[PDB]
């Protein structure tokens, strides 16, 4: 029996909160990137170091440790980019029109233009960020969404355990909304709005994955073995 299902809503929240990975910095070089090499280099470098934290974060997500190593591997390989992206969007909320990859790295669509097929993804990321902002997404909600992506994205490509743990997180989201004074109707409407954004997050992940693949074939920007293997799992 998994411990996750025995946790209370409040016991689910401060665990996800406490499990949060830190906000990493990019190179301290003050040169605004415009080339693909410089931009993607900074992005992949940051992604590399974030992946290490994401891995130790996932292990802190209730119910995740109760999975087989193989399942844990499959879920991370499937959701890693979705997880990186939703984190990017969350950090970018307070910076309209900007993408805060790192406190010392904010990019706009003008810099995405200098990389074919990148601007479209930026616009999608910016739109998602904007959406998060207008909904006044709360940190407690964000952490719940991120965990849902981890357990959901690869749940099929494989049982009740994950479904039960996902239900548990659903209870926690409603809990947060009720605790925030939302009406019963406002609760299920916001729940729906939040979950529907995951569809768009998945979309951006799949588009980003394709772009990262072609980039791998051009073999200009160096990719870490970890990124390659994570990226590899998507074929």
């Amino acid at each position: 029996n998994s411990l996750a299902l025995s946790l209370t809503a409040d016991q689910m929240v401060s665990a996800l909160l406490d499990a949060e990975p830190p906000i990493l910095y990019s190179e301290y070089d003050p040169t605004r990137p415009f080339s693909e090499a410089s931009m993607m280099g900074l992005l992949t470098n940051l992604a590399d170091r974030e992946l290490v934290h994401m891995i130790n974060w996932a292990k802190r997500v209730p119910g995740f440790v109760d999975l087989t190593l193989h399942d844990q591997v499959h879920l991370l390989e499937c959701a890693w980019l979705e997880i990186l992206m939703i984190g990017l969007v969350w950090r970018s909320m307070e910076h309209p029109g900007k993408l805060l990859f790192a406190p010392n790295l904010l990019l706009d669509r003008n810099q995405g233009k200098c990389v074919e097929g990148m601007v479209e993804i930026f616009d999608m990321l910016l739109a998602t960020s904007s959406r998060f902002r207008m909904m006044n997404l709360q940190g407690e909600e964000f952490v719940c969404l991120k965990s849902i992506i981890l357990l959901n994205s690869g749940v099929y490509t494989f049982k009740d355990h994950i479904h039960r743990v996902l239900d548990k997180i659903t209870d926690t989201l409603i809990h947060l909304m009720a605790k925030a004074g939302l009406t019963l109707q406002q609760q299920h409407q916001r729940l729906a709005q939040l979950l529907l954004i995951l569809s768009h997050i998945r979309h951006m992940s799949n588009k980003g994955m394709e772009h990262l693949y072609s980039m791998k074939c051009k073999n200009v920007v160096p990719l870490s073995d970890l990124l390659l293997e994570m990226l590899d799992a998507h074929r």
Binding site: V52, I55, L69, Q72, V73, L76, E77, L226, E229, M230
Partner: peptide, 10 residues
């Protein structure tokens, strides 16, 4: 033998 296999252990 994935790097991910190793990192998930430690």
């Amino acid at each position: 033998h994935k790097i991910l296999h190793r990192l998930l252990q430690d």
